[PDB]
Design a protein around this ligand. Structure first.
Ligand code: MG
Ligand code: ZN
Ligand code: ZN
Lengths: 121, 74, 89, 99, 50, 1166
């Protein structure tokens, strides 16, 4: 079955400068689209999802926003393990985890939920 | 005419082919030349003691016989 | 709609400066810094600014006058703040 | 055919149809003269910068179209930015002077 | 990302290891499917429909 | 204060040679290996053309090895494999380098046609090449021995030469030799020697080359470039993503050709490094060095040596020089020219309902076009939760979105464009009107400016996104704001075919019709009579009308009377605004009069009234034409009753001349010509026969016996009105059609005696075929030929923009009627209209100023000039304008789509060229190439010769092949004597005095002469009168302004005579020159000023010289421009149009003209 794998890497790459069609300056390379870019109709919805979660995060308690912004990487370097957050907040382990639940819970029952649900399609 | 194939082909074509006797002549000259330097190296005191310092390191398990000598005559 | 801007070109001679000035003004309305000087028919900031030129209440001078004024209006607010930056010495 | 924001080419970032939602319309030299004969400079800049060749201005623009602020912060078209590396890849030192 | 990750925690969705490549009808053209053909590599097991 | 160091808004650009240290500055690593990608894990092999270490991470904010994968770690260089984790964009930027084993020649400075290394060293090319290939030794810094510095030796010669002198003599070979030569060269010293040598020997052959070399040298010195740098130590490598390896479907990979090329240069280089440590024989390291030289050449510019072919692929691989280059100049901005977002296109249809300012836009096109606008408005009003949900709403086409779209559309123009954009009217702004259906609807009145049919032409739409673009679209490119062609002030909005057939049928009168003789109170009850069925549309009737004349001072007078008119004209008067007299509608109203109606409406009531009027004319035109039931049947084309008789009578003539040729009474040619003429006479006879019968034949009775009026026959009405068809084309339908012509250009002596109402037989049809077939080709080639002309034209003008306000020169040209041989081939009023007077003009008596000095001449002033008998008016032109680097508006003229004098900053160069180019499709020594010949300055083949200098002349010496002409001036020195070949028949009288510039022979004259001998104003007049002849013979109206602005650019350059600052013979800008000798006349030297002589350059030759090198790199040969600038270290300041577009900024004209101005003064300013 390695014939396929082996046979593939064995092929020589095609000159991207290969003229194709119309005799026009259209060349093979002119048609290879960029897949690593991000379309603007998207990047905009990202800048929007930030404003959304930031809105729904002012709706929580001051400790719930800090603990949730901590538990995820929101507007901070990395993110913090639920124990790590425990050391910064001083009441540790199970205490923090409950707060997390209610936070997700308060954003769960729709008033909060109506704006953020539309991001998942 | 540029086109470097030609200025090469024409550059080597000047060198005359060796006679079958000429081949042995050149090889003999080579032997003398290297052999001059081989004997010339043997006359250096540091060349011996260094060889000594390398084999004393081989027996102490600080090196291997393959990283120092390729073998003697034999 | 605004069918012909001919009336606006009379107030400011250049006809290119009409596009520039009406733009600067049209932004005073679109980014919300200001409000219209004349009844808006639902005409977009593009046309509202041109109607404002037609009526002769907006051109490069007026705008420059208002802005140089707002600098001192804001310079009036911040007075006690920046002077408090006497820690300079 | 009509296109708002489509996919884009890798070699030069320029509108290209990949979904068969066709890449935008080609704006030519003669069409450029037409904008230069009219006094329209900004229509021409936005045509050959933010609407096409500018890998930044397009996104910086798009967020403003929905934001309700019509502006462009054009920057430099990727076409010329490539010409720069290409000349400079030769023995030619090409710099952008002053301020 | 952080805000996408919070989104998944609230709505509890498992984001797949697979991307959607499905062939969908070109925009605006509408018709009736009058046929389907299925070619399969020789050696891969033919699917149900095929 | 501190200026900066980080990013600002850059001005200008510099180009120069690159130092090895300079190339190393750019390099983020040495690419040391030919490896590309790993071959299993497709990851980049490290230290290879693609290297994450050298260039950048394959994926965003992620290390190659994968240790730092977090978006937090950023400036971190991984300790394992160094990759600073950053966006993959940096793989598109970071360059690299390669340190070359042996030195290497740069193909661009070695092989550009004027070999830079060659004339910098004053050394032949073949010698330099013989040194690069190791084919001979060259001396360097020869000392005092036996040998010259640049002298070349052979193996044996060098050896013998070496044995004699061991040192104090030096010789090398190869790249190192050339490099040693260039480094050793003392540039300062060569100039001194070169300056002296210039002075000693006087020969054109000698000092011509001398000045070329000295110019480069002092240029190269002042440049900052070091000659050594033309020989490559370090070779930059282009960033990987600009020659990417990207994969494709089915798993094959595809990559740029540079990779095949770069790899070779790396390999040979690497082997060479190796061959030194192996101490290979001479014959090899030389060969490896030669091989390295070839690869560098193929990488840089391919095709200057062997033309290397890509791996496994026949096609020669495309190189770096070929990436910049192309057909023509640059690929980037050239046609065509970059694709653009927020656009569309489709088939177009009519939409007579549109007001003149709008267009039908398909519903669907508008949804996809305004998509971001719709999204933001949807969540701005809160109909959508978030931008994503907004996407889903419009993606669903929810019913509420259509109303929001009407909002984003309301005031928001769209650009419509057609295919061959010729003049600026090829793009016009409209207000969009939402339309069901997939078709774009286009106002009929505009269909003319675009040259847009309904036979399926397709048009493109563009959305003006930015606010400045919306006000530009609405205030500049808007339909209602350009109603007049810029080529001539006449309206381009003229009613078209159906509409003019309506108004023609409306205002027309037959002899007896319902309501004839009655009288009505006003247009209102005239329409009440017509629509109700009482009165016929055209019947002679008196009706009370109230007309207006504004003859007060800005004030509308009223006057009412009983006008003797028809019913139709009474009804049409309802549309005509205010101050127009009723006289304008009282005529028969053909297409010609109907345009002058609009024209006067514009020149009296202004823009707004003309627009709403123009709309009205269209609506009414279509409507009444529809009631009329005009059609075309087969019995509508009437053949004359006497036709069979004319053909028969003319056919006897042909058999008579035939009897004369058989009897030898007439020669074959004399016969042929005779037969062609009699047949020719017949065509005229039959044609003016069916025309009389067809034209007037409605013969009718009123209360009496008879009367006869202009026929009401359908096909005739079409031709009288101007709607469609013409006496030539009608003649082909009914009377006989023409005498066709065989392909070689002869004309068949047996015309086509039948026409289309009758049948054409096989022969008649087969013969017609050649004319049709040649017809189609000619338009299709002459369409393309015309475009080439406009290209050359906008190139030579372009950067020309109205810059100053009034330059204030009293200078100007004399405007008289064209008055050719008959009476007045064009009046004076058209030539002088809209210009500005050079000096005050007199009545026939004086101390009476009619027009005061420089005053814009509008219609009243021209009528005031026509009231008085004034036959000649001197007028300022852009060709004489004193402003340097532009035209002062006062010298230009008024013309625009608006009647006001041209505004400051409008780009006239483009509009001049475009205006000259657009009509060129319609043209036909003589023809469209004749125009090209004029603008190209081409000297005719057997030109005439003009008296070089005034005074009595005579003939001297004898027949050597030239018989000398000796001129003898009265006061001055005689010495001028020209050698004229005597086998050309002369004119100049041997015993008469000839003024300088007289006709010393006959034949055409070169415009070069006219400028030199007769002067600037004279030659500019020759061009305008000659090119205008071609166009006007075809019916093309182009105001002389445009021809004049192109002309000004033709003479842009001049050649110095005297000295005291710059060089003797240098060709240079009269802008630059005039600024330099005017500055010296005061200040400076008391007066040291140098005299020049103006030159005439063809359009294509003058565009060659452009200060901006980025402008020249567009349309010229890219390779040559870049080298020639990089040697001189030329600094492009932008400042022009072409270049600012390239670099992507505001055009330094129009809306942008304010910007550049505002910055230009900040520059070179504290
Ligand atoms: Mg057509
Ligand atoms: Zn790493
Ligand atoms: Zn002037």
């Amino acid at each position: 079955d390695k014939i396929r794998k082996v046979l593939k890497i064995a092929k020589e790459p095609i000159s991207m400068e290969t003229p194709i069609g119309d005799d026009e300056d259209s060349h093979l390379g002119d048609f290879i689209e960029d897949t690593t870019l991000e379309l603007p109709l998207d990047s905009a919805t990202t800048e929007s999802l930030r404003a959304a979660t930031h809105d729904v995060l002012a709706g929580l308690t001051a400790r719930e926003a800090k603990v949730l912004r901590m538990r995820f990487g929101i507007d901070m370097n990395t993110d913090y393990t639920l124990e790590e957050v425990g050391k910064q907040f001083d009441v540790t382990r199970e205490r923090i985890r409950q707060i997390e639940a209610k936070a997700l819970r308060k954003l769960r029952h729709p008033s909060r939920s109506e704006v953020l649900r539309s991001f998942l399609d | 005419t540029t086109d470097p194939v030609r200025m090469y082909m024409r550059e080597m074509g000047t060198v005359e082919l060796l006679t079958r006797e000429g081949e042995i002549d050149i090889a003999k000259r080579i032997e003398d030349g290297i052999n001059q330097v081989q004997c010339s190296v043997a006359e250096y005191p540091e060349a011996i003691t260094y060889l000594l310092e390398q084999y004393d390191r081989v027996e102490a398990e600080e090196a291997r016989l393959s990283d120092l000598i390729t073998g003697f005559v034999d | 709609a605004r069918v012909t801007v001919q009336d606006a070109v009379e107030k400011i001679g250049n006809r290119f400066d009409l596009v520039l000035v009406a733009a600067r003004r049209a932004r005073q309305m679109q980014v919300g810094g200001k409000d219209p000087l004349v009844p808006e028919e639902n005409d977009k900031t593009t046309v509202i600014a041109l109607r404002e030129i037609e009526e002769g209440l907006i051109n490069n001078q007026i705008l420059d006058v208002r802005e140089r004024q707002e600098q001192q209006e804001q310079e009036a607010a911040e007075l006690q703040a920046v002077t408090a930056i006497a820690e300079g010495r | 055919h009509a296109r708002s924001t489509g996919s884009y080419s890798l070699v030069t970032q320029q509108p290209l149809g990949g979904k068969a939602q066709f890449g935008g319309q080609r704006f030519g030299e003669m069409e450029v003269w037409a904008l230069e004969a009219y006094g329209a400079a900004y229509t021409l800049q936005e045509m050959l910068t933010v609407k096409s060749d500018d890998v930044n201005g397009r996104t910086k623009m798009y967020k403003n179209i929905v934001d309700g602020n019509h502006q462009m912060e054009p920057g430099m078209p990727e076409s010329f930015n490539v010409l720069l590396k290409e000349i400079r890849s030769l023995g030619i030192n090409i710099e952008l002077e002053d301020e | 990302t952080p805000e996408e990750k919070l989104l998944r925690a609230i709505f509890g969705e498992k984001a797949s290891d697979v991307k959607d490549s499905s062939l969908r009808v070109p925009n605006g053209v509408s018709g009736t499917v009058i046929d389907v053909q299925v070619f399969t590599r020789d050696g891969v097991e033919k699917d149900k429909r095929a | 204060l501190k200026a900066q160091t980080k990013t600002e808004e850059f001005d200008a650009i510099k180009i120069a040679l690159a130092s090895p240290d300079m190339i190393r500055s750019w390099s983020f690593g040495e690419v040391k290996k030919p490896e590309t990608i790993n071959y299993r894990t497709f990851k980049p092999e490290r230290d290879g053309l693609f290297c994450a270490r050298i260039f950048g991470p394959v994926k965003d904010y992620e290390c190659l090895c994968g240790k730092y994968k977090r978006l937090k770690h950023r400036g971190v260089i991984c300790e394992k494999c160094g990759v600073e984790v950053t966006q993959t964009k940096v793989r598109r930027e970071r360059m690299g380098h390669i340190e070359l084993a042996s030195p290497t020649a740069h193909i661009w400075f070695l092989k550009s046609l004027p070999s830079r290394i060659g004339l910098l060293l004053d050394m032949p090319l073949r010698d330099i090449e013989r040194v690069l290939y190791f084919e001979s030794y060259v001396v360097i810094e020869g000392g005092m021995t036996n040998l010259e510095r640049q002298q070349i030796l052979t193996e044996e010669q060098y050896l013998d030469a070496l044995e004699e002198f061991g040192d104090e003599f030096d010789a090398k070979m190869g790249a190192e030799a050339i490099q040693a030569l260039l480094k050793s060269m003392d540039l300062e010293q060569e100039c001194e020697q070169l300056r002296e040598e210039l002075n000693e020997t006087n020969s054109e052959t000698k000092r011509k080359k001398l000045t070329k070399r000295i110019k480069l040298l002092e240029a190269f010195v002042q440049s900052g470039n070091k000659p050594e740098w033309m020989i490559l130590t370090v070779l930059p490598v282009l960033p990987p993503d600009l020659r990417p390896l990207v994969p494709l479907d089915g798993g094959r990979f595809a990559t740029s050709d540079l990779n095949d090329l770069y790899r070779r240069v790396i390999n040979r280089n690497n082997r060479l490094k190796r061959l030194l440590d192996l101490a290979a024989p001479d014959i090899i390291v030389r060969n490896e060095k030669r091989m390295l030289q070839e690869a560098v050449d193929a990488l840089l510019d391919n095709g200057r040596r062997g033309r290397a072919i890509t791996g496994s692929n026949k096609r020669p691989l495309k190189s770096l020089a070929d990436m910049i280059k192309g057909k023509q100049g640059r690929f980037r901005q050239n046609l065509l020219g970059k694709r653009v977002d927020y656009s569309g296109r489709s088939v177009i249809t009519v939409g007579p309902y549109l007001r003149l300012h709008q267009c039908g836009l398909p519903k669907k096109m508008a949804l996809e076009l305004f998509k971001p606008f719709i999204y933001g408005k949807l969540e701005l009003r809160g109909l959508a939760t978030t931008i994503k949900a907004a996407k889903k709403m419009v993606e669903r086409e929810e019913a509420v979105v259509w109303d929001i779209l009407d909002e984003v559309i309301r005031e928001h123009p769209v650009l419509l464009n057609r295919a061959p954009t010729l003049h600026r009217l090829g793009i016009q702004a409209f207000e969009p009107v939402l339309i069901e259906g997939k078709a774009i609807q286009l106002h009929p009145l505009v269909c003319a400016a675009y040259n847009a049919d309904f036979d399926g032409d397709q048009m493109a739409v563009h959305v003006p996104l930015t606010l400045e673009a919306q006000l530009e679209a609405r205030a500049l490119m808007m339909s209602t704001n350009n109603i007049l062609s810029p080529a001539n002030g006449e309206p381009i909005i003229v009613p078209s075919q159906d509409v003019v057939l309506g108004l023609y049928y409306m205002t027309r009168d037959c002899v007896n019709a319902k309501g004839e003789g009655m009288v009505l109170t006003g247009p209102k009850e005239a329409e009440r009579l017509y629509r109700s069925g009482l009165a016929s549309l055209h019947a002679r009737v008196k009706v009370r009308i109230t007309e207006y004349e504004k003859d007060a001072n800005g004030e509308l007078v009223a006057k009412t009377s009983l006008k003797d008119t028809t019913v139709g004209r009474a009804i049409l008067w309802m549309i005509v605004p205010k101050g127009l007299p009723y006289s304008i509608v009282n005529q028969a109203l053909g297409k010609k009069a109907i345009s002058k109606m609009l024209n006067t409406c514009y020149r009296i009531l202004g823009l707004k009234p003309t627009v709403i009027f123009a709309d009205q004319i269209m609506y009414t035109g279509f409507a009444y034409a529809a009631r009329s039931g005009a059609s075309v049947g087969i019995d509508d084309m009437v053949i004359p009753e006497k036709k069979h008789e004319i053909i028969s009578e003319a056919e006897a003539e042909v058999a008579e001349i035939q009897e004369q040729f058989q009897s030898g009474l007439v020669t074959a040619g004399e016969r042929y010509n005779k037969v062609i003429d009699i047949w020719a006479a017949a065509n005229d006879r039959v044609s003016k026969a069916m025309m009389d019968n067809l034209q007037t034949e409605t013969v009718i009775n009123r209360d009496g016996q008879e009367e006869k009026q202009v026929s009401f026959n359908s096909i005739y009405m079409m031709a009288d009105s101007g709607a469609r068809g013409s006496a030539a084309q009608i003649r082909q339908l009914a009377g006989m059609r023409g005498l066709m012509a065989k392909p070689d250009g002869s004309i068949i002596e047996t015309p086509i005696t039948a026409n289309f109402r009758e049948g054409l037989n096989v022969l008649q049809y087969f013969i017609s075929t050649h004319g049709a077939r040649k017809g189609l080709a000619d338009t299709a080639l002459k369409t393309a030929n015309s475009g080439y002309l406009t290209r050359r034209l906008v190139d030579v003008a372009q950067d020309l923009v109205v810059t100053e306000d009034d330059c204030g020169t009293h200078e100007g040209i004399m405007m008289t009627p064209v008055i050719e041989g008959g009476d007045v081939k064009e009046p004076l009023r058209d030539r002088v209209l809209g210009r500005v007077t050079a000096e005050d003009v007199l009545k026939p008596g004086t101390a009476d100023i009619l027009v005061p000095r420089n005053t814009l001449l509008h219609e009243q002033w021209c009528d005031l000039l026509e009231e008085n008998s004034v036959d000649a008016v001197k007028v300022r032109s852009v060709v004489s304008c004193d402003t340097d680097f532009g035209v002062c508006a006062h010298c230009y003229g008024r013309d625009l789509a608006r009647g006001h004098i041209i505004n400051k900053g409008e780009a006239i160069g483009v509009i001049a060229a475009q205006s000259i180019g657009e009509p060129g499709t319609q043209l036909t020594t003589g023809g469209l190439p004749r125009v090209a010949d004029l603008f190209e300055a081409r000297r005719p083949k057997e030109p005439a010769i003009l008296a070089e200098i005034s005074g009595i002349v005579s003939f001297g010496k004898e027949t050597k092949g030239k018989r000398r002409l000796v001129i003898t001036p009265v006061d001055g020195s005689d010495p001028y004597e020209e050698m004229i070949p005597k086998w050309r028949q002369l004119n100049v009288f041997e015993g008469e005095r000839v003024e300088r510039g007289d006709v010393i022979s006959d034949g055409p004259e070169a415009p070069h002469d006219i400028l030199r001998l007769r002067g600037v104003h004279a030659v500019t007049r020759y061009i305008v009168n000659e090119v205008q002849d071609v166009y006007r013979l075809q019916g093309v109206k182009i105001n002389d302004k445009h021809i004049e602005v192109i002309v000004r650019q033709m003479l842009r350059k001049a050649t110095i005579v005297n000295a005291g600052s710059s060089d003797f013979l240098e060709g240079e800008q009269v802008e630059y020159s005039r600024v330099k000798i005017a500055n010296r006349e005061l200040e400076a030297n008391g007066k040291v000023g140098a005299t020049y002589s103006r030159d005439l350059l063809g359009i294509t030759k003058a565009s060659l010289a452009t200060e901006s090198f980025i402008s020249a790199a567009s349309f010229q040969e890219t390779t040559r421009v870049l080298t020639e600038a990089a040697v001189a270290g030329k600094r492009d300041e932008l400042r022009g149009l072409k270049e600012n577009v390239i670099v992507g900024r505001l055009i330094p004209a129009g809306t942008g003209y304010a910007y550049h101005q505002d910055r230009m003064r900040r520059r070179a300013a504290g």
